[PDB]
Write a protein that binds this ligand. Structure first.
Ligand SMILES: CCCCCCCCCCCCCCCC(=O)O
Ligand SMILES: CCCCCCCCCCCCCCCC(=O)O
Ligand SMILES: Nc1nc2[nH]cnc2c(=O)[nH]1
Ligand SMILES: Nc1nc2[nH]cnc2c(=O)[nH]1
Ligand SMILES: Nc1nc2[nH]cnc2c(=O)[nH]1
Lengths: 247, 261, 178, 38, 261, 247, 38, 247
């Protein structure tokens, strides 16, 4: 039960050392029902053009790297037809199979926390101002210090949202322990207070990858150990066609 | 009630309850009946007081402001939010989405800075977009369709029930998103907080001496449904319109890893 | 033109200039929009804080019986800017209205919203789209008929329309003793 | 119930429900306590 | 609840739901299911709070006047009408005929301009044609058949219920007609407004110092039936005995017909 | 369904381009019932002498004409036997088939609002006085300006009663669009708070004809385009015989 | 009901009735949504 | 049977003087069946995002204007989500409701031929060379003469494909006779020798609008009489996801 495969919309994912997929809060994503819907317009359901695996830019994991975060759905804009249906539609749902994968040898050690946090409302570096939208969204890095300026407070102990970073285990999450597994798959149903929401101005969840045990290896092992994020929306549907937004 | 402890004996077998893998995102479901030898004990302990209705169902102070009798300091205005005070904020910033309807209780205590006759207070609530009064003889105060409470001192505190008045299927404690569609303007939960201002004044026309009343609003959530739990707040509450923070130590320190009192 | 009768009539002409320019354009939210806050839909809506359902815009053409035309009335949900060309406006929920014997057309704004209700007051979180009108072809008129006509607009609610949170109206604004 | 409105009612403190399975073990493949994890 | 939206598909037929004729006096009954393609959605939205009983059924201020203790300024008189204050007037001038019975709530707040003992107030209602008092020791105040409320301060506000006391089958908000049969005299709804004067005084005989009380009457219509709806008032409320007005702009202006924020 | 005919008491009305008749509030007028009556005297019911079409004075519709209003029942005094039964009786009901008719060519354009407003309590031009009864009742004309004096405020935007003139669509009304129809027929049941009312001192409704789209035509078309009002009471009954009133 | 008088009673807010047919389509000849108006 | 309405994917089309829609060769378009398909990949079927009315740029119809032609599907590129699914997919089908509309008065005369010709393989102006792709695809105009150069031979008598222009009546077509109708709607099923074909390098049909009777009107009538084309694909489905093509 360590080997697993995920095939979505002409893109399959192979893993051979992995924990089983974690279904966020025990709910598998699905289309919006007729009783819980709010928009009387026929939604667009391109199941194979958008609901497929998209591979983000990989990041180098070093001995002193604090962590990273992505903000979805927005991070998936201008990527395939999933980003084109954002610009032409006003509403959207998805279910985001998140496949974070980081391989190593049996002579490397380290432990990542791959956690999906719904509504990770970040905090500004200077407590009396507001920071631009380019700060939130090459994933932004945490820092093992305290930054100052018109930035998101990207310290690691307070994970950006101002909590204990060890208490991020309450969210749907996995661990990549390099002796056990080299990938972590999290399935996230559509979590929001509203049945459909705009995908640009609203970040439904953020993906935080935080090494609790840092990477360590002796001389001779490969120093370049990259972390690759492969996110695939599921059961994505759109509503409210209009002219394309320039963003 | 909570689960009883089943009796176990000495075991020597190829089954391993203690051996787990945390990296599966899985919390082990083991009991003390799996690790050691236990006796049969009947647990009559219940989890009745840890429920969300009992936890959140206590009236917490959410607003204090003064308004004087005999200008704009003659009446109070609140523009309703939970974020005014820290203790109820940390309970509500513990769940991402939560759906409840609240009753509010006012504690109005007038204090002299010549004898006050009797003080009658008006707590007028304007839903968002309504006409705001800029004076005590505003004309707004007549409440044709605004809810309003008239209270004279020396009586029970004014308690009225409020429904779930949110536009969305739940109140959102956190909103990781922007106000405008171009990702601009106001960031955070402030955008979602569209609940009307709360206006409090003395319906007494004047007074022979300066009387300063203070109001204390106590929300108590009831019929509570909460979704997506999140960790409690660690660092303090610098602002009211944003979750901004100074970085703080995660836990109190020790001198050594072995050191213990 | 507000304290007159020319506020209601929409100037629609026959010419070669400005056929790639909108005929009109306004906010779709009937509470704060400076066009339809005063209608019967907007007068009964300003006693309330929340509103839900579809509104529909009816367009009566008040030209001559010989003058014919076609118009594109479009609704575009928020998220992008106002449509500046007819190409960008025909991507929203539009209707091409041939003008003939019927002489009236209904654009039903279909209630494409994220939430179940919207705020009557103007806030970014729940803001309605844009209602623009364009020349599909032109207004064509015979030699002896008057070449400048005008469209008369209407607005009402559908059967799934509802208002939700009572408040006072801001219009009356009493100054003092009567 | 002395009022018609449902929000104007007593708090339903009596009911006690819980589903800790959606937080402690949200995994797809069932994991037995007895068996090894992998 | 409101009507659900039925699912529709692509249509190409000789039927035309969008094509209407407004000049028939007819409002088109079309839905978004007729113009575009829709999904099936179940509307659990209700129109419970837009009804006339919920709309008009809130207590609005209708009368404020002062009366002093220790002449004719010693007591108040109102000669009952809805037209004293603008916000409830615009709700009642929205229907031509409307039949309701109201309960009135008084908010009486005494203020000192030496210690007041306690203030007890009398609100005497004389039906039309009854004897009016010209003094506080009038002799009229004894209420053999006039309804009257005695209220001492520090208690709940005086609420009493009133029936539908009109001569006609409904109250008329508007009366496009004259008082005399020769089309002469008083024009408008003043002719129909035959509801008695309302007299309020302190039953305290005197006071050592000047005490000025103010009363606030709050009508709340209930058991409401309304006929012949009419548009809401645009221009303000210059008078109380007539619908007189200065002409005002119909709507707020823009800079262009295309101009939009 | 464009041709229609109305025959009342020896007077028929022919129209060939018209919308269907509008029944005011969905109630057709009738005689007063025995349970809703108040006067124990045998009412006079001259069904053919009074319940017939009466044709008022026609008005010229110009390019800049603001509008007109009549006040009924009073406008029908000293017209036939319907006005004679007003002077001798104290009470009265009717049901007023209102047939407003305005014909044009296919080269004229314009759009009238023929609206019947119950209890159109007018407003005085100077806000602190009262105006005579000859101001209310050759129909009085609106003005596209602001008048001053001892007159009814006959501005058009505020239709005299102090509301938005576009919001007069709530009342029973039709439109005369010169490309579609040349007549507008409105049936008005007896609308009052009282079962019978005097017809002289009380104006049950007023008939407002307001051109929203003004009349327009090139040179050669007929400039004189008159608007004719043909009002016919229905189910009229009278009570309270007395000596004739001198008005 | 603690009082004999009918005016001394609670407001009947619960009932919800409506007949919009007497305002939106008060016409004599029935007009079908599908068919043309004239 | 002159009034008609067409509602596709949130966009309806109203016409009141029209001939009935012409179904090309008596076949209504549909999705590709399982027995006539060739690509074993799940096709993308965005029925409401792409299958809707798209309005092309209108053209001025003059007394001496020879004609126009568009080349579809290609003309619908970079227009809505129908053009975005071209750039990301390799295959495509559709069914193209074509609604050509041209209104006039009763004092204008003229007669257009709105004909859809499958595989209108054009001819070069100089008989020994080949012309660029910008010549084929503001619609290209015919000429009432003979052009020369590296261009498509856009004479009108030989309609570009080298046939008699009066013999274009064999194709699915309508006429816009300005005394009878002001619109022409043609429904075109997917006509090709292959079940799916690429939409960029292949032009399934061209839309030729040719005035046989030229526009004529006296002085005073409106000179600007535009012709608007409103084409809506139907039952469009796509296959072969890949990176976006830069065209
Ligand atoms: C006198 C009338 C008083 C009426 C007061 C109405 C109070 C509005 C409801 C309270 C708002 C609750 C918002 C909670 C949002 C969150 O949990 O973050
Ligand atoms: C102490 C006894 C108090 C009795 C007060 C009686 C009040 C009379 C009823 C109120 C009049 C309502 C008139 C409404 C007319 C309209 O709607 O225009
Ligand atoms: N493939 C799959 N479909 C589901 N539908 C509901 N739950 C599931 C699940 O766990 N896996
Ligand atoms: N002629 C006629 N008599 C009625 N009696 C009740 N309704 C009607 C109606 O609509 N027409
Ligand atoms: N709407 C519609 N569907 C079809 N399916 C097969 N033929 C037809 C047709 O002619 N019209």
């Amino acid at each position: 039960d360590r080997v697993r495969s995920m095939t979505l919309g002409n893109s399959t994912i192979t893993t051979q050392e992995s924990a089983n997929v974690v279904v966020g809060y025990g709910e598998w994503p699905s289309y919006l029902s007729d009783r819980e819907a709010t928009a009387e317009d026929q939604p667009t359901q391109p199941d194979v053009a958008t609901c497929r695996f998209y591979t983000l830019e990989s990041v180098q994991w070093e001995k002193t790297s604090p962590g990273w975060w992505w903000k979805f759905p927005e991070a998936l804009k201008n990527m395939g037809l999933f980003g084109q249906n954002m610009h032409y539609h006003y509403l959207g749902r998805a279910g985001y199979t998140i496949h974070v994968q980081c391989n190593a040898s049996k002579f490397h050690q380290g432990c990542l926390l791959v956690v999906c946090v719904p509504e990770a409302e970040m905090g500004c570096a200077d407590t009396d101002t507001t920071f631009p939208a380019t700060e939130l969204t090459t994933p932004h890095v945490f820092t093992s210090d305290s930054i100052t300026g018109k930035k998101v407070q990207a310290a690691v102990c307070n994970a950006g949202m101002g909590v204990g970073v060890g208490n991020l285990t309450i969210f749907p999450h996995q661990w990549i322990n390099l002796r056990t597994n080299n990938s972590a798959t999290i399935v996230i149903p559509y979590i929001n207070s509203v049945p459909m929401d705009n995908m640009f101005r609203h970040y439904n969840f953020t993906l935080m990858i935080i090494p609790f045990a840092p990477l360590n290896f002796t001389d001779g092992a490969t120093a370049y150990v990259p972390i690759t994020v492969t996110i695939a929306p599921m059961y994505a549907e759109y509503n409210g066609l209009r002219l394309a937004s320039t963003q | 009630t909570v689960a009883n402890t089943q009796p176990s004996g000495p075991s020597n077998s190829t089954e391993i309850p203690a051996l787990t893998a945390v990296e599966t995102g899985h919390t082990s479901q083991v009991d003390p009946s799996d690790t050691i030898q236990t006796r049969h004990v009947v647990n009559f302990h219940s989890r009745s007081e840890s429920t969300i209705e009992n936890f959140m169902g206590r009236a917490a102070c959410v607003f204090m402001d003064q308004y004087k009798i005999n200008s704009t300091d003659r009446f109070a205005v609140w523009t309703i939010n939970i974020r005014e005070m820290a203790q109820l904020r940390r309970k509500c910033e513990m769940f991402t989405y939560m759906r409840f309807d609240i009753e509010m209780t006012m504690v109005i205590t007038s204090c002299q800075d010549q004898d006050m006759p009797v003080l009658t207070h008006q707590i007028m609530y304007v839903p968002p977009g309504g006409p705001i009064p800029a004076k005590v003889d505003g004309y707004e105060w007549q409440t044709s369709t605004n809810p309003s409470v008239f209270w004279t001192e020396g009586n029970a505190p004014p308690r009225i029930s409020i429904p779930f008045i949110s536009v969305g299927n739940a109140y959102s404690s956190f909103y990781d998103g922007w106000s405008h569609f171009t990702q601009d303007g106001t960031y955070g939960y402030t955008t979602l907080n569209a609940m009307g201002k709360l206006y409090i004044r003395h319906v007494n026309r004047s007074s022979p001496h300066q009387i300063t009343s203070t109001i204390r609003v106590y929300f108590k959530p009831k019929h509570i449904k909460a979704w997506v739990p999140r960790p409690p707040r660690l660092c303090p509450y610098i602002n009211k319109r944003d979750v901004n923070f100074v970085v703080t130590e995660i836990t109190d320190s020790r001198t050594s890893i072995t050191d213990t009192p | 033109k507000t304290k007159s009768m020319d506020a209601y009539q929409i100037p629609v002409g026959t010419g070669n200039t400005d056929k790639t320019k909108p005929i009109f354009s306004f906010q779709m939210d009937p509470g704060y929009s400076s066009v339809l806050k005063r209608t019967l839909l907007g007068e009964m809506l300003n006693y309330y804080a929340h509103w839900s359902g579809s509104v529909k815009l009816t367009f009566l053409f008040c030209g001559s019986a010989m003058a014919t035309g076609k118009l594109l009335i479009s609704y575009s949900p928020p998220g992008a800017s106002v449509p500046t060309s007819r190409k960008d406006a025909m991507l929203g929920t539009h209707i091409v209205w041939d003008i003939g014997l019927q002489s009236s057309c209904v654009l039903c704004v279909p209630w494409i919203s994220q939430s179940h209700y919207r705020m009557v007051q103007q806030d970014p979180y729940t803001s309605a789209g844009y209602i623009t009108c364009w020349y599909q072809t032109n207004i064509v008129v015979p030699p002896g008929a008057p070449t400048s006509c005008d469209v008369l607009c209407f607005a009402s609610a559908c059967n799934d329309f509802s208002v939700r949170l009572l408040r006072d109206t801001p219009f009356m604004a009493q100054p003092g003793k009567l | 119930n002395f009022y018609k409105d449902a929000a104007s009612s007593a708090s339903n403190r009596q009911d006690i429900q819980q589903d800790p399975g959606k937080f402690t073990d949200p995994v797809k493949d069932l994991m037995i306590k007895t068996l090894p994890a992998l």
